[PDB]
Amino acid sequence: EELFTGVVPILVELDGDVNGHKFSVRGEGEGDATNGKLTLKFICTTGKLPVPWPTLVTTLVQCFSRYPDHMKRHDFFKSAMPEGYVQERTISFKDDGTYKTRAEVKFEGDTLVNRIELKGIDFKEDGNILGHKLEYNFNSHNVYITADKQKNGIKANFKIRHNVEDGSVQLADHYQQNTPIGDGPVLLPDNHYLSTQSVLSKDPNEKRDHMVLLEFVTAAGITH
């Protein structure tokens, strides 16, 4: 919490396997929780990414959300720091495959590190994911968080809306659970949500398959 007062370096490491296609992503940048802001560049270090970059955005550090003062009692993510938390998700792409992800989010020295294993199964070879038919952009979402007292953690549920190149929308249902790594006490929040926004771009000097991401997230849903 006091660990987030300024700008914090971020490292993201993802190992993925989707319908047997193996890939790795490495991301580097910084987080400014005071303003809810993330600035990162991600590289596919194994060559071509076999799924669209937008499908990995949510997997690729909610401790950088801005929690307003009146919500300070509800910030599980920072309260678990520095020892961190496990973040697990199931992502269900409507009429296509699923991702299962397990990550650890924790400080390693001065750097906030998100280390992820992703397994994707049951994707259509000519669907929107393996067929690379999703637009290179991101919509603004609401991440609904609830406490899971018995697990000493939280759950989240939300839908990601991926614009498709034919003008339709590909929904991705997100089920999420977070548990602390360490033994120290954490905050168990009242129901609230994170309001998100982001933009995806390219670095014209970067020849590797990559994504530049700028993201802003603020907590809300508890009136002062």
Residues at the site binding Na ion, with contacts judged by CB under 5 A: 73, 175, 187, 204
Shortest distance in whole angstroms from residue 55 CB to Na ion = 19
- In this complex, which beta carbon is closest to Na ion, that of residue 114 or of residue 176? 176
Q: Where are the alpha helices (DSSP H) in the chain?
A: 76-79
Alpha-carbon distances of 130 from 19, 21, 76, 105, 166, rounded to whole Å: 9, 10, 35, 28, 16
Shortest distance in whole angstroms from residue 126 CB to Na ion = 28
Alpha-carbon distances of 51 from 39, 97, 124, 168, 207, rounded to whole Å: 22, 12, 12, 18, 18
- In this complex, which beta carbon is closest to Na ion, that of residue 48 or of residue 73? 73
Shortest distance in whole angstroms from residue 78 CB to Na ion = 12
30 contacts 8 by C-beta, under 8 angstroms: yes
- In this complex, which beta carbon is closest to Na ion, that of residue 162 or of residue 174? 174
121 contacts 200 by C-beta, under 8 angstroms: no
**Cα–Cα distance between 185 and 176 in angstroms, integer?**
20
- In this complex, which beta carbon is closest to Na ion, that of residue 2 or of residue 149? 149
Closest by CA position to 39, among listed 68, 67, 69, 60: 60
Shortest distance in whole angstroms from residue 59 CB to Na ion = 17
At residue 209, φ and ψ (nearest 5 deg) are -65, 125
Shortest distance in whole angstroms from residue 73 CB to Na ion = 4
- In this complex, which beta carbon is closest to Na ion, that of residue 6 or of residue 175? 175
Omega of the bond prior to 82 within 30 degrees of 0, cis?
yes
- In this complex, which beta carbon is closest to Na ion, that of residue 35 or of residue 90? 90
Shortest distance in whole angstroms from residue 104 CB to Na ion = 22
Question: What residues are paired with 174 via a beta bridge?
Answer: 91, 158
